[PDB]
Write a protein that binds this ligand. Structure first.
Ligand SMILES: [Mg+2]
Length: 121
């Protein structure tokens, strides 16, 4: 009934839009945010979310590196990549890294909820 969620994106305004969308749901409760993949790995270990929304392109450590690391340690965490046209070229890397789904910027709330609810019926 509650899905503990992390939001990872180097863009604060994209994190904020996604937080506002999820805030309208009792179900997806945001428990942490991170702005790069290294912080995401550490936060995932500390918080043990059910779900991570993972931007792909981020400075220093990207979402592919973070997805692989988190999947190696705690494979039960669902990781949904947060993609966009400018990240298209990294989507196959995310498939190979074990992503569980995708949501798309610019955000559409119904599509996000469809995607999340498929993983958390
Ligand atoms: Mg980015």
């Amino acid at each position: 009934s509650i899905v503990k969620t992390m939001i990872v994106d180097d863009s604060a305004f994209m994190r904020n839009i996604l937080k506002r969308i999820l805030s309208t749901t009792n179900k997806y409760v945001v428990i942490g945010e991170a702005a790069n993949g290294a912080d995401a790995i550490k936060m995932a270990e500390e918080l043990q979310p059910d779900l991570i929304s993972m931007d792909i392109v981020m400075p220093e450590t990207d979402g592919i590196t973070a997805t692989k690391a988190i999947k190696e340690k705690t494979p039960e965490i669902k990781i949904v990549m947060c993609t966009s046209v400018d990240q298209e070229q990294k989507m196959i890397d995310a498939v190979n890294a074990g992503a569980d789904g995708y949501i798309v910027k610019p955000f559409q709330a119904p599509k996000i909820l469809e995607q999340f609810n498929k993983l958390f019926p």
